[PDB]
Amino acid sequence: AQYEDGKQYTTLEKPVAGAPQVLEFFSFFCPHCYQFEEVLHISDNVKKKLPEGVKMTKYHVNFMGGDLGKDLTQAWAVAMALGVEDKVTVPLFEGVQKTQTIRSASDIRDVFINAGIKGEEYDAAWNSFVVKSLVAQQEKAAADVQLRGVPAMFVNGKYQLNPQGMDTSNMDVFVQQYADTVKYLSEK
C-alpha cells in the first residue's frame, strides 16, 4: 500500500481508549521539537489539513531536563489554563535552546511577564489546583503510551507518527507528508 504500518506510522500494541483525536508530545529541551515549532510549523500544517470537527492537543513531558523539565511541564499547564500557548511557545523554546537564558522557574516566569501575563495572574495559576490537574493530565497521557521520545504524535489513541520513515531532502515535502499522514490516519 502507499501508507503502511511500520513505515509512515506504527500501530500501538496497546491502544488507548478515550484518547484525544490528535495528540502531540514535546519538550522545550527537545531539538527536533524546536524545529517542529519554528522551522517546520508541524502543528499548524496538520491543523490546516485536518477534517471538520477535529480537536488538537499538545502536551509537555518531564523526562528531559530534570528539575527544569517539570517546571516547564507546570508552565505549559499554566499556558493552557490561561490560553496563552501562542505567546510563550517561541520565547520558551529560544530561552531554553538558543539564548540559554532559562535556568530556573523564575526565568520561565519572566517569559510570561514579558509576554504580558500579569505576575499575580501567573502566580495564581502556577499554584492553582486547576493547573495541578492539568499537569496530571499531561503525565497520564504520556504514561498511557509509555512515551520515551519526543517529538511524538498519536492519532485516535491507536497510531503513532513515524517521521523517520519520510524524506527530509526537502523540508516542505516532509511537512506535507507528515500532515497528509495524520489526515489519512484520522480518516482510518
Scanning the chain, the segments in alpha helix (DSSP H) are 31-34, 42-47, 66-82, 85-93, 105-114, 119-127, 129-144, 171-187
**112 closest CA partner among 139, 138, 86:** 86
Instruction: Provide the grid cell at 3.
Output: 501508507
Structural domain including 47 reads 1-188
* CA distance linking residue 28 with residue 78, whole number of Å: 15
**Structural domains counted in the chain:** 1
Cell of 46: 496538520
User: Environment class of residue 99 by beta-carbon count within 10 Å: exposed (0-12), middle (13-18) or buried (19+)?
Assistant: exposed
Task: Report the residue count for the chain.
Answer: 188
Nearest to 139 by CA among 48, 8, 25: 25
CA dihedral 15, 20, 24, 28 (to 10 degrees): -120
* 3-state percent helix, strand, coil for the chain, nearest multiple of 5: 55, 10, 35
Q: Which three cell numbers stand for residue 155?
A: 492519532
The C-alpha atoms of residue 154 and residue 157 are separated, in whole angstroms, by 6
Q: How far apart are CA 99 and CA 163, in angstroms?
A: 28
Query: Any idea what the CATH number is for the domain that residue 167 is in?
Result: 3.40.30.10
Angle separating helix axes 105-114 and 119-127, nearest 10 degrees = 130
Cα(116)–Cα(10) distance, integer angstroms: 41
Q: Is 167 exposed, middle or buried (0-12, 13-18, 19+ CB in 10 A)?
A: exposed
Residue 72: alpha-carbon gap to chain centroid: 12
Phi, psi of 155 (to 5 degrees): -115, 125
Distance of CA 45 to the CA centre of its chain: 14
Report residue 92 as a C-alpha cell.
520558551
Method: X-ray
Which DSSP helix (H) or strand (E) runs through 60? strand 56-60
